[PDB]
Amino acid sequence: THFEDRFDAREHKDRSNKSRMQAMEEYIRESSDQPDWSASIGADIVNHGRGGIKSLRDTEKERRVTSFEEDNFTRLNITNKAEKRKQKQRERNARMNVIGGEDFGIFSSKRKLEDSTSRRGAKKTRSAWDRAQRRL
Amino acid sequence: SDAVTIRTRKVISNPLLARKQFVVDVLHPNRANVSKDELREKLAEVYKAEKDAVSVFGFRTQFGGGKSVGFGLVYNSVAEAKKFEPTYRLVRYGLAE
Amino acid sequence: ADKRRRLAKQYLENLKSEAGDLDKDIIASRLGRVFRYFGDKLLISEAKQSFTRVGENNLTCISCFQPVLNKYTFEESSNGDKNKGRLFAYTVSKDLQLTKYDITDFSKRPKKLKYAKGGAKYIPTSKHEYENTTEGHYDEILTVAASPDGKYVVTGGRDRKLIVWSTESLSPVKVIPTKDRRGEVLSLAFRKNSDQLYASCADFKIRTYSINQFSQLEILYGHHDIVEDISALAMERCVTVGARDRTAMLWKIPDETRLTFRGGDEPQKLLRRWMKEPLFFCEGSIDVVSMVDDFHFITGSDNGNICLWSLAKKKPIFTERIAHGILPEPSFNDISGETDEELRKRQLQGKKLLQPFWITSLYAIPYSNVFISGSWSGSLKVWKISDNLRSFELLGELSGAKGVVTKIQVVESGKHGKEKFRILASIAKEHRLGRWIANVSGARNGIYSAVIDQ
Amino acid sequence: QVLIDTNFINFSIQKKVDIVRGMMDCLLAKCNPLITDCVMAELEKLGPKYRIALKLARDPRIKRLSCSHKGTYADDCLVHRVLQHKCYIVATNDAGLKQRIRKIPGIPLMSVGGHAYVIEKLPDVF
Amino acid sequence: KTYSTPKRPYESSRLDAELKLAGEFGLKNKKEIYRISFQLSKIRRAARDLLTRDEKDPKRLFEGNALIRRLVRVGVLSEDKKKLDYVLALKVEDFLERRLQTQVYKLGLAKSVHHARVLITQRHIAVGKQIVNIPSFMVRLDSEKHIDFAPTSPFGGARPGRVARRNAARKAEASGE
Amino acid sequence: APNPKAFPLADAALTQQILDVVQQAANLRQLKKGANEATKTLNRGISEFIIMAADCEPIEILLHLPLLCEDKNVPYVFVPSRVALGRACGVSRPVIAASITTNDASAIKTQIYAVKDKIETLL
Ligand SMILES: [Zn+2]
Numbered sequence A: 001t002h003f004e005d006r007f008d009a010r011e012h013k014d015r016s017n018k019s020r021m022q023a024m025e026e027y028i029r030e031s032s033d034q035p036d037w038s039a040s041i042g043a044d045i046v047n048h049g050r051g052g053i054k055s056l057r058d059t060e061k062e063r064r065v066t067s068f069e070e071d072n073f074t075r076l077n078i079t080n081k082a083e084k085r086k087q088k089q090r091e092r093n094a095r096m097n098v099i100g101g102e103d104f105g106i107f108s109s110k111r112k113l114e115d116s117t118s119r120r121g122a123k124k125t126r127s128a129w130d131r132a133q134r135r136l
Numbered sequence B: 001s002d003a004v005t006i007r008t009r010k011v012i013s014n015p016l017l018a019r020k021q022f023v024v025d026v027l028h029p030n031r032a033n034v035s036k037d038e039l040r041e042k043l044a045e046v047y048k049a050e051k052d053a054v055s056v057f058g059f060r061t062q063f064g065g066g067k068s069v070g071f072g073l074v075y076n077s078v079a080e081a082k083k084f085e086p087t088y089r090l091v092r093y094g095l096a097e
Numbered sequence C: 001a002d003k004r005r006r007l008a009k010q011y012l013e014n015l016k017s018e019a020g021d022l023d024k025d026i027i028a029s030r031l032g033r034v035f036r037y038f039g040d041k042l043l044i045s046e047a048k049q050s051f052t053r054v055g056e057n058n059l060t061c062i063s064c065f066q067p068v069l070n071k072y073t074f075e076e077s078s079n080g081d082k083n084k085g086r087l088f089a090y091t092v093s094k095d096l097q098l099t100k101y102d103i104t105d106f107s108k109r110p111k112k113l114k115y116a117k118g119g120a121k122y123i124p125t126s127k128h129e130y131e132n133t134t135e136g137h138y139d140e141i142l143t144v145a146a147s148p149d150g151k152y153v154v155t156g157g158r159d160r161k162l163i164v165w166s167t168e169s170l171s172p173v174k175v176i177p178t179k180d181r182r183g184e185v186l187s188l189a190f191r192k193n194s195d196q197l198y199a200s201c202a203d204f205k206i207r208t209y210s211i212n213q214f215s216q217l218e219i220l221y222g223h224h225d226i227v228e229d230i231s232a233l234a235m236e237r238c239v240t241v242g243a244r245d246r247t248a249m250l251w252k253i254p255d256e257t258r259l260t261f262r263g264g265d266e267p268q269k270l271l272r273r274w275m276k277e278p279l280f281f282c283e284g285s286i287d288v289v290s291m292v293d294d295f296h297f298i299t300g301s302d303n304g305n306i307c308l309w310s311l312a313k314k315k316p317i318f319t320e321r322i323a324h325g326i327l328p329e330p331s332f333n334d335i336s337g338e339t340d341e342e343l344r345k346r347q348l349q350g351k352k353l354l355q356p357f358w359i360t361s362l363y364a365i366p367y368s369n370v371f372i373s374g375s376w377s378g379s380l381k382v383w384k385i386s387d388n389l390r391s392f393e394l395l396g397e398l399s400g401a402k403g404v405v406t407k408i409q410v411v412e413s414g415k416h417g418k419e420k421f422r423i424l425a426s427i428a429k430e431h432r433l434g435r436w437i438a439n440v441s442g443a444r445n446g447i448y449s450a451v452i453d454q
Numbered sequence D: 001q002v003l004i005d006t007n008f009i010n011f012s013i014q015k016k017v018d019i020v021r022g023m024m025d026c027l028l029a030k031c032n033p034l035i036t037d038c039v040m041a042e043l044e045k046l047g048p049k050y051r052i053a054l055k056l057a058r059d060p061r062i063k064r065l066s067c068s069h070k071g072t073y074a075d076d077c078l079v080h081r082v083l084q085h086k087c088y089i090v091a092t093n094d095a096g097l098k099q100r101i102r103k104i105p106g107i108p109l110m111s112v113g114g115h116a117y118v119i120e121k122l123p124d125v126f
Numbered sequence E: 001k002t003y004s005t006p007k008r009p010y011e012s013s014r015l016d017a018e019l020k021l022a023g024e025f026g027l028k029n030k031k032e033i034y035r036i037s038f039q040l041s042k043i044r045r046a047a048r049d050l051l052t053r054d055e056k057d058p059k060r061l062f063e064g065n066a067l068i069r070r071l072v073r074v075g076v077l078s079e080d081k082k083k084l085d086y087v088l089a090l091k092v093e094d095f096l097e098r099r100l101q102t103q104v105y106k107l108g109l110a111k112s113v114h115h116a117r118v119l120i121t122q123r124h125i126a127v128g129k130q131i132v133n134i135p136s137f138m139v140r141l142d143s144e145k146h147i148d149f150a151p152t153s154p155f156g157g158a159r160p161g162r163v164a165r166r167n168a169a170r171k172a173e174a175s176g177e
Numbered sequence F: 001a002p003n004p005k006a007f008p009l010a011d012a013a014l015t016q017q018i019l020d021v022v023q024q025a026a027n028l029r030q031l032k033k034g035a036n037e038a039t040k041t042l043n044r045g046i047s048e049f050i051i052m053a054a055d056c057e058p059i060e061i062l063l064h065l066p067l068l069c070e071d072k073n074v075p076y077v078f079v080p081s082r083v084a085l086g087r088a089c090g091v092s093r094p095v096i097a098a099s100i101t102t103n104d105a106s107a108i109k110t111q112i113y114a115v116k117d118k119i120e121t122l123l
Helices: A022-032 A056-072 A080-096 A128-135 B036-046 B078-084 B087-092 C002-018 C021-030 C267-276 C332-336 C341-348 D006-015 D019-027 D037-046 D051-057 D074-085 D095-103 E012-025 E030-052 E058-074 E084-089 E092-098 E100-107 E113-121 E141-146 E162-176 F012-028 F035-044 F065-072 F082-089 F109-122
Strands: B005-007 B012-014 B019-027 B054-061 B068-075 C048-053 C088-093 C097-102 C111-117 C141-146 C152-157 C161-166 C172-177 C185-190 C196-201 C205-210 C215-221 C227-231 C237-242 C247-252 C257-262 C286-291 C296-301 C306-310 C318-320 C361-363 C370-374 C380-385 C392-398 C404-413 C420-428 C446-453 D002-004 D033-036 D063-065 D089-091 D109-112 D117-119 E125-127 E147-149 F031-033 F047-053 F076-079 F097-101
Touching: A022 C002, A022 E058, B005 C215, B012 C021, B019 B054, B036 B054, B054 B087, B068 B078, C002 E058, C088 C141, C088 C152, C097 C141, C097 C152, C141 C185, C152 C185, C185 C227, C196 C227, C205 C227, C227 C286, C237 C286, C247 C286, C247 C296, C267 F012, C286 C361, C296 C361, C332 C341, C361 C404, C370 C404, D002 D074, D006 D019, D006 D037, D006 D051, D006 D109, D019 D033, D019 D117, D019 E030, D033 D037, D033 D074, D037 D051, D037 D063, D037 D074, D074 D095, D095 D109, E012 E030, E012 E092, E030 E058, E030 E084, E030 E092, E058 E084, E092 E100, E100 E113, E100 E125, E100 E147, E113 E125, E141 E147, F012 F031, F012 F076, F012 F082, F012 F097, F012 F109, F031 F035, F035 F047, F035 F065, F035 F097, F047 F065, F047 F082, F047 F109, F065 F076, F076 F082, F076 F109
Parallel strands: D002 D033, D002 D089, D033 D063, D089 D109, F047 F076
Antiparallel strands: B005 B019, B012 B019, B019 B068, B054 B068, C048 C446, C088 C097, C097 C111, C141 C152, C152 C161, C161 C172, C185 C196, C196 C205, C205 C215, C227 C237, C237 C247, C247 C257, C286 C296, C296 C306, C306 C318, C361 C370, C370 C380, C380 C392, C404 C420, C420 C446, D109 D117, E125 E147, F031 F097, F047 F097
16 A cells, blocks of 8 residues: 555654643632642732732743753753843733733633533544443 | 952862862851962962862853852863963963963 | 532643653762651560750750761761760750750750850840840840751750850850841751751841851742741742731742642631531641651641641641540639639630640651650650651650740660660740740749650 | 613613723722613513523622602603702613703713713712 | 723722722722723623533533632632622722732821822832732732731831931031031 | 529530630730730620630639620630630630730731621620
């Protein structure tokens, strides 16, 4: 016959941070009840209060870039186009969504949660014996 | 009075080139950004080392004071220190011309 | 809500379906738990119990320097050649006096080696709150700890000054003002085999220093109410408990990050389980704490509750109710001031006005399965933990003490096989902080000692 | 708490806006819609063409507050209520009543217009 | 935009309402009032569309839980009032309460709201660890118990300020000369 | 057989709620603490509500306060334990009756109003 048999780089790549759906992530944190590793107040606030506290995402992103330094042992620099773009966007969304350290653009957005759940979603239950097997 | 604190965080080691690796925070309340030369000597006694072989660099100070972000090394031989350092750092330490 | 848990499981499998190791390991090459289980070898019923009273009143702590030899230095981790590996007890008194005892011999009652009492001339000539460098204490010393490297010993309490003392001269070797009006030092701890000092302070702060250079390292913030008690271990951490907020919070010092553990159970909920089957109380205020390993710790509240906590969960893994018991019940003649006995009973009003004993202090030797609690029941209660680390049990009692227990320390002795443990507790008439305890008798302010072997 | 008028019911059925829903959309709050007893009189008189506007004014989510006035004039029932109490929002669309309540101070007035409802004298509109 | 002009900006009701708000909270602009009310409109609009989404819908379930819990972590909502009709019931004055300069005045570190304004901009008030100096910080719960004076502030800390020290030296010169 | 005169006490849940709010009032100077301080405040008229211990020896010396409270419609609640009230008020000694006073420059206003309703349902 004929086919390709090539490295599925895109399939061996990850999309979990793409499909993360933060409100129900927050819920599953509440349910799975492990304590949170939150920081103290001075570790929170940004720049003599000129900006907000920080977002929880921004805490995560700082922790990860600090990990890039932790292992990789090098920093970023003042590269013009990219960080100007990202810094502007993140600060604009800071001044338009986050209030006191938590964000509400998550509700002003338009990404649904049924496109994540989808009544079991992937490898879904579409036959009655599949219903029987999942119920047992 | 002043808790002369540079936390040499991100602590790792490399004995191929024989040098030790560590990041910098600077916690130093009521002090104005301690300088790398007295840091060099202070690192020299704490690591029982050479005044050239100590090598830290690139310090940025955090808000709220008594906190600075930098990026530091130490060699473990005089030959390694005198050959493997780039010359801009050699003149920052005043060892080259 | 079963729909909700269904969808949560659905997302769990969904993200599992959507979802260098040897490199990290080889770099790591290029760079704990509970390990004792001797909580059965004790011979509690035949323990030696002894008492001493001290001329001052209201002692509050003890600091037995236990010199542990290093494997990098077999001889002594203690500096001098005249200390010779003895054991020292440091006791603070609301008489504003520190007293140094030798307790090195388990046959003899502990012996006062030295003392230092501060009167009132150590108040500052100025109310400036900044310059506070009078070398002696001047109010209500409340907590003490000594250096594990035998170098210094430091006290701190309501006069907002952390004063550290020489171990030999007993001179005030350094003074540290807290630089606040509300900076009352409440609890002290050392990093084990280190010089780092952890200070719980009731302006919601946890301050940390290096003592051998007298240097204010780093500051922590975060409770709802006063940061009451603290304790450390080998790791660069601490655990602390806030009093009137029901939160015990664990601090990773260098990463500057915290974990919060609450309570959450209920007298009504215990009513419900007994319906599915007495008297229940309310989770009032988290007071005493000690951490037993790097993964579990134990805290005692005001309503008698003793709680075993694991860092894995957030809720307590093992609650224990009124364990030191129910207080002396109010007498009818003094409740009423009126003759009739039945009216006096009606004023006493049955089960409601009862009160539980507190949990005034609690201590565990590290990495063991044993911990000691103390109330003013006049009875130390010694507890042993099951090796699954999901429950403990009352091992037994030591009633050789009486009155309000305040501070509990242990001293190990003997070699690896055979070990003899002395329990040393300070007992005052009152609580550490206020008065709050109404006419218990039979107590003398001083030290209680017990010695058990094997 | 909103005092509905006969006009409002008729225009709402014309412009196909839900009463409680569209009203609660426009406020962005929670609202109790009240038909006064004399307003249901005017609907019932107006009669056999508006059997539908009646039959839809009698929803179970439209509470009824009565009235003690010998007569049937909804407009006077409403203005006397409002001139006393000043805890209400008056939903109407008549021109004469609109100018009466615009001279009264402190009483939000509410109209239907175009697609959905609009508010005038609440500052708390967004 | 980050501020939106209210659609009937000059009205008897609007106008006297803003007068009361700015006078009582010590603001200085319609712009400050507008910023708060615009973001409240977005929140409350989200909650209303959530109410349109029917009972026991998974989206309504999870996101309503999210919105309630994050508003109580911000603190404008209270612990025992966990429902979406209460997130509908909020209004502007609750956020304007949670500002920082109101919070310094309410705790009691100053006397009047304008005093608290001048303190915070004067760099004396220190939430948590840093010196905050923006009078619209929107303090949360944990910090609203942690507001107090900065340790280098001469009200709760180090040596007196420059007017005091020039004056003490001036009377020192008075006694000297 | 009938209700004793200590009625009403509070459950443990109301107890911890009230001790919580009275602590935070003592932090912020809305608390007048002690018997005749509560009395002077109930004569001035400026007190939100009254917290009376019921452990006291005897009951009577503070039992005089329900008269003034019911004279002025100001609610009162017995907590069980007087050293728990000393606990909450943060002074060093058993306080048999404290009184939370009225104010508006108050970081704890709505917390107080919630507990005031909880009392007035309990009556
Ligand atoms: Zn009518």
